[PDB]
Structure formats: C-alpha cells, structure tokens
Design a protein around this nucleic acid. Sequence first.
RNA 1: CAUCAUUCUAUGGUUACCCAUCAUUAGAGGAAAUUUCCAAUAAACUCUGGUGUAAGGCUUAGAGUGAUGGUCGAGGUGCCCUAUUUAGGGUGAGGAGCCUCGGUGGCAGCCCCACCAAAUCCUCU
RNA 2: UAGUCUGGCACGGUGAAGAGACAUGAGAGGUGUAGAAUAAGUGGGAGGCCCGGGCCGCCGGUGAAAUACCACUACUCUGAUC
RNA 3: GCUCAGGGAGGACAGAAACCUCCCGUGGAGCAGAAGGGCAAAAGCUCGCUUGAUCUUGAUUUUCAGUACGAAUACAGACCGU
Lengths: 136, 68, 104, 212, 75
Amino acid sequence: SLGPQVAEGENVFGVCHIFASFNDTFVHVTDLSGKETICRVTGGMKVKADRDESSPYAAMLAAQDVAQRCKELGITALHIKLRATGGNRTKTPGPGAQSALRALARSGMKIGRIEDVTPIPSDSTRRKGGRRGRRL
Amino acid sequence: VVDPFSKKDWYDVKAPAMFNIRNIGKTLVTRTQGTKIASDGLKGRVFEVSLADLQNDEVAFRKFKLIT
Amino acid sequence: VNVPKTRRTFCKKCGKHQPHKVTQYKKGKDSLYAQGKRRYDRKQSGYGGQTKPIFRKKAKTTKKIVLRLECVEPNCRSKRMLAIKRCKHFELGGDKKRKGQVIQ
Amino acid sequence: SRDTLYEAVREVLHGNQRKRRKFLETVELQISLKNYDPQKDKRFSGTVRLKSTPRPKFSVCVLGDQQHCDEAKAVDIPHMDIEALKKLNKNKKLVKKLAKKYDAFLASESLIKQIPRILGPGLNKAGKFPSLLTHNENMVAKVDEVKSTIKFQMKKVLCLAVAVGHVKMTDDELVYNIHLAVNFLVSLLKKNWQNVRALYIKSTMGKPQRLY
Amino acid sequence: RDKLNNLVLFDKATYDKLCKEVPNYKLITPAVVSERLKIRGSLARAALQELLSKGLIKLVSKHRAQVIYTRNTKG
RNA sequence: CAUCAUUCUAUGGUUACCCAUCAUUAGAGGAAAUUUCCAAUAAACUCUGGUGUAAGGCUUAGAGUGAUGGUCGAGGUGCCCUAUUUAGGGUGAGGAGCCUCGGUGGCAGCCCCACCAAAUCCUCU
RNA sequence: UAGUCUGGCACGGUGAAGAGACAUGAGAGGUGUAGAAUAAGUGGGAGGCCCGGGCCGCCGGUGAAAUACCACUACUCUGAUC
RNA sequence: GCUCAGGGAGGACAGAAACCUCCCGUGGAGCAGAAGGGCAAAAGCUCGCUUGAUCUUGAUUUUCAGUACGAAUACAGACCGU
C-alpha cells in the first residue's frame, strides 16, 4: 500500500469485474491487466441469508467495502466490465449490477469505461432443463 | 496472518511509439521472493486498452491487446 | 476400597511407629540393561523367531493394589511396600462414609 | 575454560602511555561469556577470593558496641550505636534522599542477631547486604572488606563487570589481581562448557590490550 | 418495583430546604415542590397557604385543578 | 457488637529472604429456562495449602485513634436481533472483576431531572 | 520366510541459483509514570574535558536504580562474505 | 451406652403404612454375600478414639505324600491402639 505514483491529479486505474448473477453479485477490482487482483467482496460475504445474496443492497455493501479497500492501496479510478451468468444461461445482468456500480460512483471512485463481458456463445452446448422446460 | 499487498512493486506499462498517449496504467507485482522473480510472473500480462485512451482524440469503440 | 493418605504405622529404620504418607505403587520402566532383558535380546536376535513364551491366557481382571508407605520424619524418609487384597475400584482418602445421611 | 598464560607476565608497567588522566583510577576487567541462561537456575553467583588488596572505595558502616568500637577508632570510622538506627530506617517511603546513605552494613557474632526486627531485614532486602563477617577475630574486621575479595553476581544480560586492579598499588599486585583471579575462575567451572573465550584485559581506561 | 415514599410532614432539613431554596426558583407549583423536595402534593399545597401570608411567594394563577406561585418580584 | 487504616510497645520474625498478587499442581459445590414432578445429570468460578518470580505493611496479642452504634455511597456495568446501526426491538438464570463523588445543559450549585464511554466476560439456556 | 515396497549408508563426482542455519568484522536499535532529558544492561563515579581559562555532572525529582569518561554482552531490522 | 424383628394399646393433620409414648417381645431381627454354625448389658444398633490390616523369628493345624500353596491356630520378641 505504498506506490511511487504521482499523488495530485493523475489517476491510478484498476478494472472492477462486476459479475451480477441472479443468486449473487461479485464486485472484484483487479489491475489494468486482470492478472493481479486488489479487492473482491461479494453479496453473500456481507448479508447472511441466501435469498438476499443477490439483493441490490447486498451488492451495495460489497462495492462500498471494495471502494474503501481500493482507496487504501490508492487505485483512484475504475474501468468497468459488467457480466451476466452468460453462456447458455441468462444474458440479462442480475438485480445487484446497477446498485453495485452506483455504490462506487457514490463512494469516491472515478468511473473509467463501462462495457459488457457477458460470455455470449457464438453457438452453444445444450441448456440445463428439459425439452418441456423448467415447469412451475 | 500477514498482508500480501505489503510486498507489491508498482510498474509502469508503456505503449509502442505507433500510439500517441504513452502511459497505459500501473501494474502491482510481488517482489522477487527467492526463486520466483518480479519480471518472471509479469512478462505475459494482456492490457485491453481502448483507442481513445491510447491515441489522443479518435473513436472509443476500438480496443488493443498489448502484452509485456 | 479406600485407604487414607496418612497412616501412623511402624518405620523399620526409626524402629518405632511414626506417621507415614500412603501413595499407590506403580511399576518402573523396564531397564534395557537388566541381565534378563540383555539375555533376551541376544537370544531373540537373528533367526529362530520368538524364543521364549508369550503369555496369552489372561484369567484375572484386578491386581493386589500395593501402598508405597513413606516415613514423614526427614532424617529417615525410609519406605516399604504394603500389599492389600484384590479390589476393582480404589481411591486414596476419597469421601469418608457417613451414618444417618439420606441416600437421595 | 583454561586461559593458560603465565609466560612473560611483565610490560604492564607500560602505564604512562595507556593513561593520561589525573585522578583515583580502578583497573577493571570484563569476561567473554557464551551460551548462558538468564531465567532458570543456571547459577553464576558467590564470591571469588583475592589475597592481594584490590581496595574498593565505597561508603562503609559497621554496627556494634564491642572491641570493634576502639579497634576501628584507628580506622577513623563513624562507629554508631543501635539508638540512631531507627530514624535511619523509619523514613524509607516519604523522605526523597537515599535513606541508608552508606553502601555497606554488618551483622556480627556475640551480636549474632544484629537486628532481626522489622527495622532489621528491611535493610537486607533492597541492596547493600550486611554480609561481611567480624566473628571474634578482633585484629582488623572493618578494613577487611575494603582489603578482601572482589564480588560477582548473576543477572539477565548474560555478561559480567568487575573491578580487579587500581592505579594506586604497583604493577606486581595487579598481576596478583590476575594470577589469584583467573587461577580460580577457570577452576570455578560447572557444565556451562568452556565459558572463557578470551580475557578483554584493560587498564582503568585506554587502548585495547590482550592476554589469555 | 420502584416505590417513591414522600414525606407527609416535613423533615427538619426539608422545611429548612423549603423555607430557603423554594423562593430562589422561577416557578413554585405544588407538583414540582412535591416531585423535587421528596414531599407530598397535598402537603406542598398546604405549605404555600402559610408562605402566601409570609409574602415570600407570588400568587399568579389559582384554580382547583392547578394553582401556580412564583418568586417574589425583583423590586 | 463487626470489619478495615495508624503508631506505640512485647525476652518473639528465616533474610542469599518474608508477604500480598501472577500461575500451575493437591479437594468440595448450582439456580434457572421446561411443563407434570421425581431423583439425577452438567459447567462457570469461589474457599484453603505448596512452590516461584517486582515493590514493601504480613498473618500473633494489648492499647490510643482515622469511618460507621446502622453503613460505604448505589449507581454504570451483559448477550440477542435488526439496511431506525452516535439508533431501534428483546427480559432468562446464576457466577467474579472495575472509574469515583463525573463534566455539561434545562428554573443554573442542593434537591431533582435529563444526556456521553472507561475493565467486564465466560456456560447450561 | 522368499520376493515386493519404503527410508538410511556406501559406490557418488562437477557447476550455478535460491532458502533456512551458523562464525567473522558494522550501522541503526529500546520511551510504567515522571526528572527538563526515547532510564537496553551491569563494575564505575564525584569525576572528567579542550585552547591561564568553559561545559556534562552532583542536588531538585520520577523510580528498587541518573549520564562526562572505560568497555562488554542481552535484544529488535538492514547489510557485506577465503 | 443401648436392644432387635414383630405384636398389642393409645395419640392434631394421619389413612394398611410418617411421627410420638407405654406395654409384650429367647432373638422369631441383624451380623456385606451362599448356606450352616455362633451371638442379647453382644458378635447386632449408635457414638468416642484409632490404624494389631504394622515389624519379626520359629512351632503347629487344615488339604496332605503327612510335599507345596492358600487359609488358619497357639506362642515369643518388637513397636503400638484402645
């Protein structure tokens, strides 16, 4: 947590890999690369009941705990890669996505570039569930 | 029981001269700790750098994988 | 049974009755240089297999509990063994049995 | 353990070069100790006897009312009776000066129990122990602590500091502060294996010298 | 649980407190005098008919439900 | 009548060493939630001795006197749950270890009342 | 008990790199209150110092214990090797 | 020092059975256990103090070969308890 970085105005970047599935939300800051990571706290790490692991509140608590951990190391700004469950599963990002991004837009982190890395298959394997689907 | 982030050297990422904006960002790496070397586990990192961050005033829908 | 940790009994060296300190006897560790254990290993070593009997037909379940009497008067400090009859349960000055007391 | 030097024990008259001071000097000595335990009963205590008058200069008080009154009147002693010892040892808490004042006391024989009251062993459990013996010898018995052995104790720094010699006496009894010191503290040996590495021989004050 | 046991007649110290410290206030109501000085509400009314005819209080409002007194005026 | 603090004494006290504490070794023991009881059950930690490490009165008996014919005041002291989290909502039992007469406010300092913490935590619930 | 598996010793050698040790020669290096003063720790000691002359002392005071000038070992990080 | 099992007669609550007295009470109870023997100012019951369940030579009895072991009986020398 001591870098020879110029301290005033010139920003120090990481990229936060916000992976919002429908049953958990992962706010995970890494470097510019992704190879070395900085902070990772999830929805389920904060709120201790399984149904509100994916709540937008649980994802907010995470991104607040991410951001204040990220200011100790002095990574000022964040690039963003938003991600849904993806593959053959759902491409619409989870409910915790926006609240978690807003949480480190309210914390004090500068926002770099936002994109989707939702692992979109060109052409997929077979999907879990039947011919007749997931009945209820 | 100990901080792993205590022992992170902070290295600069240079873009080749064909691009305008030189400095890309900052890459924390664990120091040489006996066998495994700082430069060793650093010489294959991809950087997904947008053109707008790399060339001065141009399109911001093009990215460039640059490896150390 | 139950034996008290104190016993005003005969001390051989003192030649009188003096108060002793009662403690349960245990075995010592077998010396590796006792003549029998030396003879054993010389015989046991090499080929021939087990040379002397291994007792297996274990019949009795309790010991003759032995007391290690120790003279309290600090010039003497002489000791002797005091073997008592076989008993399963055994304690040193546990809880004196009382009379006119309710068994609840 | 054995130092074994007795070879050509002179050249300690090279004193005018090692010294350029003026005053009362004490030719002190420190010994190299290795692999010793501070906390446990690793015991390095008692006294190592010198025969050859080292002459330690400290504040001495001797308690009695005997021949040792008029025997020590030829020493110029402050000889004191029992009815001045109460005000010496009453004020031990409030009065901010060091109350004992004099860095030696005494328990006698014929006065065997000098004082075993609350005003007595209050003194033998703060330092400066009333240790020196004055049985019925009655020929010196005062100056024979300032003329007798040098002392050593154990503490939790693994080291030792002791005063062996002096400026005042000639350089023939100061090698008898080596001869009758190192002949003992070699033979003074328990299983603190080969404790004597080497002997950092000193003047009072000056440049390094080596014997062993 | 907690049982407040007030004085029906004045302890010597409490009348020494009531005939000293009560006119030093800005209000004299028979419920504050009762609450504060550990005396009774009816007794605190009986105290202030006597201190009325001493001329050391000030009768501002008197009603059956609520009588109010205050300190004697500055001048 | 009880307990502590004080000095004065007493043929008294082991000084390479006494005692309160810190610790480990040597034994005895529960209320309650849970009902309808029965006899259990099963801790937490206290009491007395050894030994050992800082200061320095011991623990014995007599007398004078600190604070009470009756004392301390007499009050803070936990866990549990919650996106009212400098706050709100619970209500069980029984065990040892600590600031001092607080500061501020309101009719001020007394009587009251408010409001901000000191070290509390272990177990059968 | 054959064989089998396993560890050690010998045959059994060269060269580098890393690490944990350890001897050699060093710097930084300790803060119950309080004394004006980050009191490692003992043997000091009212005694020194330099260009005829001054300072650190001593006491006052915290504590079981206070420097100038002689040395050593306790013990925490760095750091060089025939 | 006491007398037990059991019975009779009484006595608030109290009944077939709690407790309290008086009377009868040869053992009809009890003495750790199997059974037999023994036992009433005791060998039982309740208290008091205790460690003779200690130390030591021999002899003897029981089984018996008249050998061991176990168990036992009379002494003797100590030291002890009551």
